[PDB]
Structure 1
Amino acid sequence: LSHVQQALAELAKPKDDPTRKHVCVQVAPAVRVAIAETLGLAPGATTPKQLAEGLRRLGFDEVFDTLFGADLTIMEEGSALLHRLTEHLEAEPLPMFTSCCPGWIAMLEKSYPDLIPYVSSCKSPQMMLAAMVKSYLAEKKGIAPKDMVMVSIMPCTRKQSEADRDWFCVDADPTLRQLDHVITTVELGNIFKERGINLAELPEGEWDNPMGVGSGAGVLFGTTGGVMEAALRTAYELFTGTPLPRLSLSEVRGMDGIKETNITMVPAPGSKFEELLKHRAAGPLAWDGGAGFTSEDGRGGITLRVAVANGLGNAKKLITKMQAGEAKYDFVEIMACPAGCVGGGGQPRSTDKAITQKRQAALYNLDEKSTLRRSHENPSIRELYDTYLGEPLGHKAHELLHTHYVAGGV
């Protein structure tokens, strides 16, 4: 039985059935914008809450926004970056690579195992949310993890292999998956139509909060610009005490699918970061000790060099020049898909050459695009850490939200 068939089997069970399980679903933003195309409509032609209603009509007991998991990734990865930056100032290496794309993680383990220490140990947004629901939420609702089923709807054909990583399980039992089944945008679209469900004709439903209390998806109003940018912002604003605006990446000449930006950071006055810049300034990626600037009275500062690679072919050319020292970066994100997740392998096929641009544009409302969201300000995220996880990068956070990598692959 395919994973789609297994999830549908769990849903086919009446809710009052003695063997019925608590079936949960989480949905990626890339899915929500592209799902309307399965009806022959434009991207974004169906609202988020219409999809929520549709999923609830399939029989899901919980409907979650993957963005909640993304806030956890931003928290952990932002802290991780700040940590590595900190220990490199006072003399887990640099540059740091992000790790949300399983296509990158796969290529990392098979072709570049010597780069493993440089990669963030953060789990993906979907896996963090999954680990959370079968731990915190299970305990809150008095449900055994074995009686909870976690489904994700993804734009990606690789998110199942990510989920199937052996140790992504509960209490060292690899049969108790943190995330059981992954369904693609087109597969979900096919399920709706085969049941006569038209999303565009549905009323607005509502999301569930992974914290098990309150209303909404447990995510505040506004946008972050994605995990990488928000992780950067997290580190930046703690380091400088000043807000980081939305990033504008510029294309690197001579390199396809590579974008970059330079971010200058002056430590906040009186901070530990100001002490470290002052009191001390004298592998496969040996890293030049950083890009720093200073001046007359000692306005000491460091320049964070960031790169983004789409996709895997273009990424190899970047790594080559990095090892050659021709490309110098501190923070690198590698996505397997040329257009990123909005153009993932699980997305509808279109004749429109600009379909990925339409998807991106329709991702959020002009209202939401104008408002900056910060993960550490999310009351649900604050509560989860204060009352359950402890500190980011800590013991509990490492066990539930972090992972490891295997040289040679799995």
Structure 2
Amino acid sequence: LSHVQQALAELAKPKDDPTRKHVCVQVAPAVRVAIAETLGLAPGATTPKQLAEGLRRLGFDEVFDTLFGADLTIMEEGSELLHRLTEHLEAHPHSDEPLPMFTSCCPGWIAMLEKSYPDLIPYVSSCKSPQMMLAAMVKSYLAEKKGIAPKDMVMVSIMPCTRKQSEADRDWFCVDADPTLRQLDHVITTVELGNIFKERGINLAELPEGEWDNPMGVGSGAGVLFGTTGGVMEAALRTAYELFTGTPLPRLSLSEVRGMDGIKETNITMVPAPGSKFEELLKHAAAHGTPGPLAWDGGAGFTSEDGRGGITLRVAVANGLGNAKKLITKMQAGEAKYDFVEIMACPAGCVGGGGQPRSTDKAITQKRQAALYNLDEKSTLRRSHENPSIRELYDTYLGEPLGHKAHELLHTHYVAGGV
């Protein structure tokens, strides 16, 4: 049986069947914006809570927003970038945590990494993706909070992507030592979900507004605050930037790199906060000979007559896989110098995933991107560490980002040659 069929069979069971599981769903933003096209409408023509009402009518017991998972991914990856930068600046880098750092949320990049780039594995962030962080959390924290055994929970994710099931199927996303209980059971694409609605005569555009559940299991709404982060990569940088400098990082505008297809970049200058440790490390020369395919050049430093020291963080974004291979070749010969790199396999990112509806409009992905966030939300910047649901989760259950419990729950590893 397909994963859609397995998921619909769990859903079809009466609440009073003894074998009825608790079934949880999580929804990616790129789904929410494109699912209206499944009914022949424009992107964004159905609201996020119309979609939550539709899912609730298929029989899900919770409906969750993958942006909660993204907030966990920001916490982890932001601290992870800052931690590697700090070890580099003190000239005591750990060998398993070199710069540059690459992101890890795209499974298409991960497969290519493991198959064709095994020497780069140590450079890749150890963070799980947003969907996996959220799955790991509901099967541990929330299960325990509700007195529900993890074996009696099923978790589905609606994704814009045909590769996210292969991410969920990596072996160690297993709950408590058996491969048989998976943190994330089933992935359904946008078009599969649109097709399930149509077969049952459910027209999203005409449903009433429903509601999201909070993965914490108390309090109303989705457990994410109003506003936008600019996405995981940007919010991770903002995390590190704002601790390092004491000053806000605005919304980033990436520019095209010339001579390379599908690659955008930015250079972010950073003066450490006065009185801070980061100011010390920059004051106290030998930050010359070292191993690895990507050898870090020691950073793009800058100076002032009076001692203002700074560093400039060199950021690149690559779409998709053929263009990423060319960046890597150039990083390896010393022609492109980057400290933090994001690789996505799709030319337009997740809004253009292979699980999305097909359109004759050459600009469909830019319309999906424009409608991802409600016009009022775009003007409010938000920060994951200020989310009271995230803070409660860390203060009562995980400890510190990068710490032991967070590592066990929210971090992963990569295998040379793939899986």
1:295 shift after superposition: 1.2
1:326-405 pair list within 5 angstroms: 326-405=335-414
1:283-298 to 2 correspondences below 5 Å: 283-298=292-307
Q: List per-residue Cα deviations over 1:142-191 (Å, max 9, x = no partner).
A: 00000000000000000000000000110111000000000000000000
SS in 1 for 2:112: helix
What is the alpha-carbon distance in structure 1 between the residues aligned to residue 203 and residue 137 of structure 2? Answer: 31
Q: By how many angstroms is 1:78 displaced?
A: 0.2
Q: Could you tell me how far apart the structure 2 residues matched to 1:342 and 1:22 are?
A: 30
How many angstroms apart in 1 are the aligned matches of 2:257 and 2:177? 45
Give secondary structure in 2 for the equivalent of 1:69: helix
Deviations along 1:96-145, one digit per CA (max 9) or x if unpaired, are 00000000000000000000000000000000000000000000000000
Aligned with residue 126 of structure 1, among 131, 136, 141? 131
Contact 1:261 1:307 in 2 (8 A): yes
Following the alignment from structure 2 to structure 1, what is the Cα–Cα distance between the partners of residues 70 and 155?
A: 17
**Equivalent pair of 1:308/1:333 in contact (CA under 8 Å):** yes
Aligned position for 1:230: 235
Aligned-partner Cα distance in 2 for 1:16–1:230: 44
Secondary structure of 2:328's match?
Answer: helix
Secondary structure at 1:334 match in 2: strand
Structure 1 residue matching 2:179: 3-state secondary structure: strand
- Cα distance in 1 for partners of 2:16, 2:324 equals 51
| Partner secondary structure for residue 306 of structure 1 | strand
Equivalent pair of 1:260/1:307 in contact (CA under 8 Å) = yes
Structure 1 residue 287 displacement after superposition: 1.1
Partners of 1:317 and 1:109 in 2: how far apart? Answer: 17
Equivalent position SS for 2:205: helix
Deviations 1:322-356 (A, max 9, x none): 00100000000000000000000000000000000
Q: Structure 2 CA distance, aligned partners of 1:177 and 1:365?
A: 34
State the Cα distance separating 1:365 from its structure 2 match. Answer: 1.0
Per-residue deviation, 1:16 = 1.6
Instruction: Give the Å deviation of 1:280.
Output: 5.0
Q: Deviations over 1:214-269 (max 9, x none)?
A: 00000000000000000000000000000000000000011000000000000001
Contact 1:108 1:115 (8 Å CA) reproduced: yes
- Residues 281, 241 of structure 1: CA spacing in aligned structure 2 closer, same or farther, 3 A cutoff? farther
In the alignment, the residues of structure 2 paired with residue 269 and residue 57 of structure 1 have an alpha-carbon distance, to the nearest angstrom, of 55
Q: Residue 360 of structure 1 aligns to a residue in which SS?
A: helix
Q: Secondary structure at the match of 1:73?
A: helix
SS class of match (2:330): helix
Q: Is the 8 A contact 1:155 1:342 kept in 2?
A: yes
What is the correspondence of 1:238-249 to structure 2 with a 5 Å cutoff?
A: 238-249=243-254
| C-alpha displacement of 1:281 | 5.4
Distance 2:225 2:347 in 1: 29
Q: Any conservation in 2 of the 1:24–1:150 contact (CA below 8 Å)?
A: yes
Q: Determine the structure 2 residue equivalent to 1:318.
A: 327
Cα contact 1:90–1:280 (8 A) shared by 2: no
C-alpha distance in 2, partners of 1:227/1:281? 33
SS of the counterpart of 2:181?
Answer: strand
Decide which moves more: 278-287 or 118-127.
278-287
The residue that corresponds to 1:300 in the other structure is: 309
User: Which whole-Å deviations, capped at 9, do the CAs of 1:374-399 have from their partners, x for residues lacking one?
Assistant: 00000000000000011000000000
CA distance in 1, matches of 2:277, 2:304: 20
Shift of 1:270: 0.6
Aligned 8 A contact 1:89 1:280 in 2 = no
Residue 65 of structure 1 aligns with which residue? 65
What is the distance in 1 between the residues matched to 2:247 and 2:262?
31
Matches within 5 A, 1:129-144: 129-144=134-149
What is the alpha-carbon distance in structure 2 between the residues aligned to residue 395 and residue 105 of structure 1? Answer: 24
Q: Secondary structure at the match of 1:235?
A: helix
SS in 1 for 2:266: strand
Structure 1 CA distance, aligned partners of 2:129 and 2:396?
Answer: 22
1:54-76 superposed Cα distances (whole Å, 9 cap, x missing partner): 00000000000000000000000
Equivalent runs, 1:47-196 vs 2, <5 Å:
47-91=47-91, 92-196=97-201
Structure 1 runs of 4+ with >6 Å offset: none
In structure 2, C-alpha distance between the alignment counterparts of 1:339 and 1:41, rounded to whole Å: 21
Question: How many pairs align?
Answer: 410
Q: State the SS of the aligned residue for 2:120.
A: helix
- How far apart are the structure 2 equivalents of 1:145 and 1:3? 19
Residue 200 of structure 1: aligned partner: 205
Conserved 8 A contact 1:69-1:125: yes
Contact conserved, 1:36 with 1:44, CA < 8 A, in 2? yes
Deviation per CA, 1:5-55: give whole Å up to 9, x if none.
000000011112111000000000000000000000000000000000000
User: In angstroms, what is the RMSD of aligned CA positions?
Assistant: 0.6
Q: Which runs of 5+ in 2 are unaligned?
A: 92-96
Q: 1:364, 1:226 → 2: CA distance?
A: 12
Instruction: Give the match's secondary structure for 2:138.
Output: helix
TM-score, length basis structure 2: 0.97
TM-score, normalised with respect to structure 1? 1.00
Gaps of 5+ in 1: none
Deviation string 1:64-97 (CA, Å, 9 cap, x unpaired) is 0000000000000000000000000001000000
Measured in 2, the distance between the counterparts of 1:378 and 1:191 equals 34
Fraction of identical pairs, as percent: 100
Alpha-carbon distance between aligned partners in 2 of 1:271 and 1:169, rounded to the nearest angstrom: 41
